[PDB]
Design a protein around this ligand. Structure first.
Ligand SMILES: *[B]([O])([O])C1=[C][C]=C(C([O])=O)[C]=[C]1
Length: 358
């Protein structure tokens, strides 16, 4: 890799691993549409397995970007419309609070207060129905944004309903396969377990636990190589031959709502570039990213803006991931660590690296 890129990455990630005590990490910088890899530490401390470009990391909420794109693909295919009411795909959902709550609302966390987490007690299919039937909106739809798994997660499940495929099957056939993301999984097979890093929480090795809507909200695991590929596809959707997928990617980068200087897409969150570091850096901290905020509707949504900082943070008990790209500069970065460390530290490092490359 150009010594230029090598220097900036090393000078930035080395002190980060040191200060955040990250056991293992993999970084991918996409520069001029070409990827460059870097890896540090351990995937498995106990078994002394090093992190490699084949190591699988939990993407956590970065999985939401795949869901947003898969939903975008369904829209492109004419299977669903973001303007359709939620009940069109789940008629069993008869509670009157759902009146006026659309797929757009579920996809963008603006349904009216759906919670961040689906309760642990909610498992069966009838349990989820009851959960949603009983839920009480604190606000009218399309007024307030509250980041939530139960919101975009439901969107993912309903979105693949017409395809007749299971969420996982739809995701593989419609997104992973076409993009050649061959080491990206919702459920990692026995054969790949050897490459699955252990997450570390308070020094204990852990992996994400099963949950309702987990696949749709935070259950994807991937390698630094496949995530580099995921970035390139999102930086250049026109390079994709599958019409509906290409279109799906564009739809996920459209700006539907605005809060502060952030714009909500389907899974991805965007900001006008050049962006102010302190603004995306502090804007990422969970003190802001997860709070209740009023949103302004973008009527109609602004189609994907090439000059934007497109990104998403992701976390699980044991993992911390981050993805950010600038379509206009054919520039991007993927950071995958097996420790959940502060978001601001991720964004800060990401910005130092990309800003230094234009
Ligand atoms: B995501 O990585 O931000 C995310 C947020 C919350 C949860 C949860 O509480 O289970 C999973 C993933």
């Amino acid at each position: 890799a150009p010594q230029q890129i090598n220097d900036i990455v090393h000078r930035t990630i080395t002190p980060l691993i040191e200060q955040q005590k990250i056991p293992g990490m993999a970084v991918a910088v996409i520069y001029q549409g070409k990827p460059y890899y870097f890896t540090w530490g351990y995937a498995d401390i106990a078994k002394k397995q090093p992190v490699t470009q084949q190591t699988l990391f939990e993407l956590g909420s970065v999985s939401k970007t795949f869901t947003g794109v898969l939903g975008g693909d369904a829209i492109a295919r004419g299977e669903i419309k973001l303007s359709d009411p939620t009940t069109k795909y789940w008629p069993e959902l008869t509670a009157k609070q759902w009146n006026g709550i659309t797929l757009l609302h579920l996809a963008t966390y603006t349904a009216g207060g759906l919670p961040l987490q689906v309760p642990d007690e909610v498992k069966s299919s009838s349990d989820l129905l009851r959960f949603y039937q009983n839920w009480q909106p604190a606000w009218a739809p399309g007024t307030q944004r509250l980041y939530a798994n139960s919101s975009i997660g439901l969107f993912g499940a309903l979105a693949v309903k017409p395809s007749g495929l299971s969420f996982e099957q739809a995701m593989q056939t419609r997104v992973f396969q076409p993009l050649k993301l061959n080491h990206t999984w919702i459920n990692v097979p026995p054969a790949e377990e050897k490459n699955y890093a252990w997450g570390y929480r308070e020094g204990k090795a852990v992996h994400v636990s099963p949950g309702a809507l987990d696949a749709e909200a935070y259950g994807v695991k991937s390698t630094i190589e496949d995530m580099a590929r995921w970035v390139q596809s999102n930086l250049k959707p026109l390079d994709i031959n599958e019409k509906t997928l290409q279109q799906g990617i564009q739809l996920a980068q459209s700006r539907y709502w605005q809060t502060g200087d952030m714009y909500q897409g389907l899974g991805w969150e965007m900001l006008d570039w050049p962006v102010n570091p302190d603004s995306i850096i502090n804007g990422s901290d969970n003190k802001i990213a997860l709070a209740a905020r009023p949103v302004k509707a973008i009527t109609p949504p602004t189609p994907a803006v090439r000059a934007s900082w497109v990104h998403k943070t992701g976390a699980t008990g044991g993992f911390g991931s981050y993805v950010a790209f600038i379509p206009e500069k054919e520039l991007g970065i993927v950071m995958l660590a097996n420790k959940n460390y502060p978001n601001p530290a991720r964004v800060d490092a990401a910005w130092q690296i990309l800003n230094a490359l234009q």
